[PDB]
Design a binder for this molecule. Sequence first.
Ligand SMILES: CCCCCCCCCCCCCCCCCCCC(=O)O[C@H](COC(=O)CCCCCCCCCCCCCC)COP(=O)(O)OCCN
Ligand SMILES: CCCCCCCCCCCC(=O)SCCNC(=O)CCNC(=O)[C@H](O)C(C)(C)COP(=O)(O)O
Lengths: 546, 108, 117, 55, 58, 125, 88, 157, 64
Amino acid sequence: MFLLSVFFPLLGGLVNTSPIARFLGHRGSSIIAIGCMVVAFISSVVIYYEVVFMGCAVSVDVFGTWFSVGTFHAGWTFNFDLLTANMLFTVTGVSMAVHMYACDYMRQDPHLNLFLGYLSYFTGFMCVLVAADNLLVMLVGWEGIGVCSYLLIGYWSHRLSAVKSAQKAILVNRVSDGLLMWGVLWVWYHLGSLEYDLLNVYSASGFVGLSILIGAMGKSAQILFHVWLADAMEGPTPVSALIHAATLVTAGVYLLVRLHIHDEMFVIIVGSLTAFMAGVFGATQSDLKRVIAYSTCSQLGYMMVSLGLGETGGEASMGHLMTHASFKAALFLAAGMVISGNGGNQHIARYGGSAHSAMFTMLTLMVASLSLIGWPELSGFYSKETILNLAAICADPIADVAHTLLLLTAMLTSAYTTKLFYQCFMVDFSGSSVTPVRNVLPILAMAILLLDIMLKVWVGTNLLSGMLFFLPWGVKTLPFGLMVAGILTATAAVGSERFTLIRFCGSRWGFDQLFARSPVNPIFDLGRITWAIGDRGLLSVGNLRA
Amino acid sequence: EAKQFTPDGKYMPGIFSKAKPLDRSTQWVHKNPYIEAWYYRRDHFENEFVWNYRTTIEALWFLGGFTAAAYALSVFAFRQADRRSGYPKRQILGDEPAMVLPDERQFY
Amino acid sequence: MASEVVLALPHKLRVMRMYRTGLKELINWSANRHEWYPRAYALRQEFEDSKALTDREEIRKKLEHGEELLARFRHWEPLIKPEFVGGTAYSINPAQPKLKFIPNYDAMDEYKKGDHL
Amino acid sequence: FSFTDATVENMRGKHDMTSGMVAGAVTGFLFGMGRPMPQPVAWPLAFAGAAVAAD
Amino acid sequence: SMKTLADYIRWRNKEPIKASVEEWRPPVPVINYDKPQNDVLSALDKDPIVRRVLINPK
Amino acid sequence: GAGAPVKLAPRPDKPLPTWYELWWDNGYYPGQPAADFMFGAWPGNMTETYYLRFWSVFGLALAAPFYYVANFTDETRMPMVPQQYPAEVRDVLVQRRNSMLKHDFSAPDFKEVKDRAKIYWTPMY
Amino acid sequence: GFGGGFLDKDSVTERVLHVTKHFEKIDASKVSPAASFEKDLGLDSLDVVELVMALEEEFGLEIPDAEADKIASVGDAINYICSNPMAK
Amino acid sequence: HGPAQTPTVFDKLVEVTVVDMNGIRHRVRGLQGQSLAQALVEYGFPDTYFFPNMGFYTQHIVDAHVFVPKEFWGKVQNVDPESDDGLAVKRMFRDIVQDYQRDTSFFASYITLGAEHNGMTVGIGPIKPWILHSEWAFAGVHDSRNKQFDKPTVEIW
Amino acid sequence: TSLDHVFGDNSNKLNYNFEPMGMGSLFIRTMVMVGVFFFPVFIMINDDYKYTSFLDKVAAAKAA
Ligand SMILES: CCCCCCCCCCCCCCCCCCCC(=O)O[C@H](COC(=O)CCCCCCCCCCCCCC)COP(=O)(O)OCCN
Ligand SMILES: CCCCCCCCCCCC(=O)SCCNC(=O)CCNC(=O)[C@H](O)C(C)(C)COP(=O)(O)O
């Protein structure tokens, strides 16, 4: 059962993209994709119960040695331990519902089986990433999900902005991939191996944690790397759900939790600044998918700070990752159903009422939104409150500012999520297209993720749930009051007259515009210099006329 | 509506035929004159080099500047490698007689 | 200040474009359409208070000030219907143009299908 | 050229390639004076290069 | 005056000649009011017209 | 709805600029710059001077509290010491520079453990 | 359905006549096809701006500004809408 | 395409009046796109009137010294005096013509016959003695009845 | 031109001269880019300087 969680989504992708799919068509390829995900989810459930609960890790030599020159030895080997089982359960369970949704959402697309094969490849490379036992097979998974993210973001290739969004995701992540590669070189040079179980670091040379942190900041879309994440909304809604829940953005946090070789000052500062920035960014957007994208960036900031706190903080970071994937995928699927019910419009000024959506879509948005804002005794309450209480008792003075930033971020999140519900359903109608979707497949796709939200409350992620870190009632129940403050403010729909702050925040602090000329235009101009002045000029040798 | 094959294979050239045969040049592009002119100009851009102010300044600060930066970095890396390996100062090109090539029979 | 296109317009069309863009920017800055209706009424009452003017200098000063206001309050995220330019559904799955086909190209003039030298 | 070479030779106290390069720069700048401008740099370079090739 | 090798070398000190011909420009969509804003603080934010048509209506 | 109409981009009918490869013409109207916001009007008509001017205040407004707590506040602000361990368990736990147990001011080797948690970059020889 | 992407003339005419009658000064009996906005109906320029914005709302269109300047009568609006493939 | 005229040779004919060095006027017919030196060769002029184009990779082209009136000065093709073709023309003026040069002096391979040359009158200019190799020279006197057209090859070696 | 009345025409042209950036702007932004993207080089140079000045202090106060 253990190799069935990794191979078999890759097999589904291989089937649906090869000339076998010429004989199946759309109708047969949908069956193949859904079955190939159901099998992998069943295998991951067995792996989860064996490794997490009964504590028996399994190591598999899959395809022998990859390459071995000198003392640099990379093998095709997996290891299934606690983190790997957690990640496999989360990835396969989310990707199954996203496949069941995409087989109905992209029904009218002309190349449906190609899209399903790309989704399966993306899932399989994520499984390869988390199942690897050494750094090089991890890099296979890293670049595989990067390539499949490029193929899926720029799926509608006749649209130029989608193509440029895919290229932007590739380039922004390529900077951090370079830094991560140099960090792998440092790690191997000063420890002698590439396998995770032999990488126990107490005191290393600083470049190790910094360069691995930069490589993780690329994929997890932290500060000065978040710019690709918002533009990745050019792709279809299943792509966004799988990018923001289970694949891609959770890979850097997984890598930092696995290695635990960071220096906590950088991690805490980057995470808290990212959380506050993405909180204020999502409060001032009107595109329905961009608000959810910025909430993803904000929660990744929370997890970054938590893994900065310590080993218990690393466990809480993995726990928040696991519970975040379910309600984030549910939020994106419900938003896709609302968009399709309103004629493709993504602006929240053109919604309202309870006619453009099913009852189940509204229930899904409500329950996932309540889990995200930390409503008591739902799924996100346990993990988010654990991170907040662990940040309130850290003995680092830097974590004092980080906790304040997290509390402000919590109020902002409960503001804009309540605004997303309020604009979508509570206000009067201001669109003109009412085509509500009530198909069986997307409704069952949403119901599965709501079942996982219930499961996280009933069965915890780890042993931290129910442990009491001893805090006064004032410190403990303040995030509930911040949630209520966000709800009351957003339902009052109040606004400020400070329009220059509004347009500074709504334009997202001008990061893209400043990047358009601080590295980008200089790279183009230095290329002009090296070609025209150097190759055609200073180094050019002419002819002798006679 | 040309016929370039007999019913049993056997390609026919159609040299004297009225209908236009499909062949290798069927999908050759129709040339835009301005695109051809721009590509010709970029192909011969060495005729446009001139030693004005901007050319001289950018060729000094970027080309010579980064070449000197890379030479300084290479010498820095060489010296630091020799220090972290237990070697004395070693003779690079133009550096007076010194040690080159460590002996394998020696412990450094 | 207006762009070089709007500055080339006749005076009637210049004022009409200013009123139209003001209504659209009020749509962009509002939360809903039901928020937008009384702001649209207020903008209409604002233009009605300068209808009976004759002095071209006062007209020019009011026109230029309003164009400065519209350049200031240009929304960074305008509301565009999805199937138009700048919308989210523009240029996704267009019908293919007619592409020509060459049947059995390898079988035409075999043994002579390389590059000349 | 010969006077500048021997002057830098006696001033620096040693025989090396610097005296030839300085003498070449001086002689080429004397040749290149009064000419349009690649030339007041190009001719010191040519005379210094002749000195360097000689060494 | 004196004849030298400097007369025979094609020195690269001649500026390339441009033409007054109008160059190609791609079409772009129209922006009706496109004055570049450099001021963080402006009196236009607190203009009475803005207060009358945006803030004050109920 | 596949097959929606889309407007085509015209071909060049005038002499081209020397550095024309900064426009992305994919065949449909409109084309774009090679990188967005490199030229043309920015969204909301803002400029680079606007963002740099607002950031010259806003950046120190965000870097101010971290500096204050990192230089004017220490471990003794906490009402309790870190989690206590037996010596055989603690002695390996505080070998990590990453650990939050080096902020235990009641430990007998508090200074020595803090002096061993200084970050270095070049490994010495 | 009907038409190669274009709405029929009669339903477009009915919808435009419905949109045009939403003024206080308008007498309903004068609203007909090929009726001028200013001379025949008695609407000023701001009323015409509002009418074209309402027709944009009615048919789900983003009418370009140069085209909206040319619309000056009911028949002009009907002929413009019947030439839109994107008119719903 | 319709009932328009069939192409005739008379549509592409160019007539040039040529005065040889004895003063005898000649009627020379050519075709559009043909150079002037080729039409002079095919008319039947003697081989002492012609000489190699003294460029690299073009000595197989025969050329003649012609006098062109001021009206047809702007229909001679342009040659850059800094290029290698310019140095070829400079070598021809330096070595073949010398002090027979006038302000109307050109070379006949640099004249491409078109409709603008129709009715143009040219004259053959004198040349100095020259040699390319042992099988192609000119001693200086135009006393030979051998036509240039009757030579089967133009030999650079 | 069959869709110009639906999506706009080609009359409005792009306002850009396709000219290189100014020399000072290019130099300043390149120096900032070198400082940001090559910060390990400056970190290691500072390490070498801080190490050799300590050995200078040792060699100074040792031979006295
Ligand atoms: C354009 C990009 C496309 C991307 C494609 C997907 C991504 C791929 C990324 C990784 C690619 C690795 C592929 C390796 C191929 C074989 C290498 C091993 C060769 C070999 O002889 O090894 C033996 C073969 O075993 C076996 O192979 C097992 C025996 C047969 C039983 C299982 C059959 C395979 C079923 C797979 C289903 C589909 C999965 C799709 C990946 C195993 O033994 P060893 O000598 O290594 O000994 C050690 C353990 N005994
Ligand atoms: C965010 C909010 C930004 C604010 C936007 C700017 C708001 C400022 C509005 C006030 C400024 C003005 O009135 S601008 C000055 C406008 N007034 C005039 O031009 C004098 C009247 N002259 C005429 O020719 C016509 O009546 C004419 C009205 C042009 C056409 O209407 P008709 O053809 O029917 O006749």
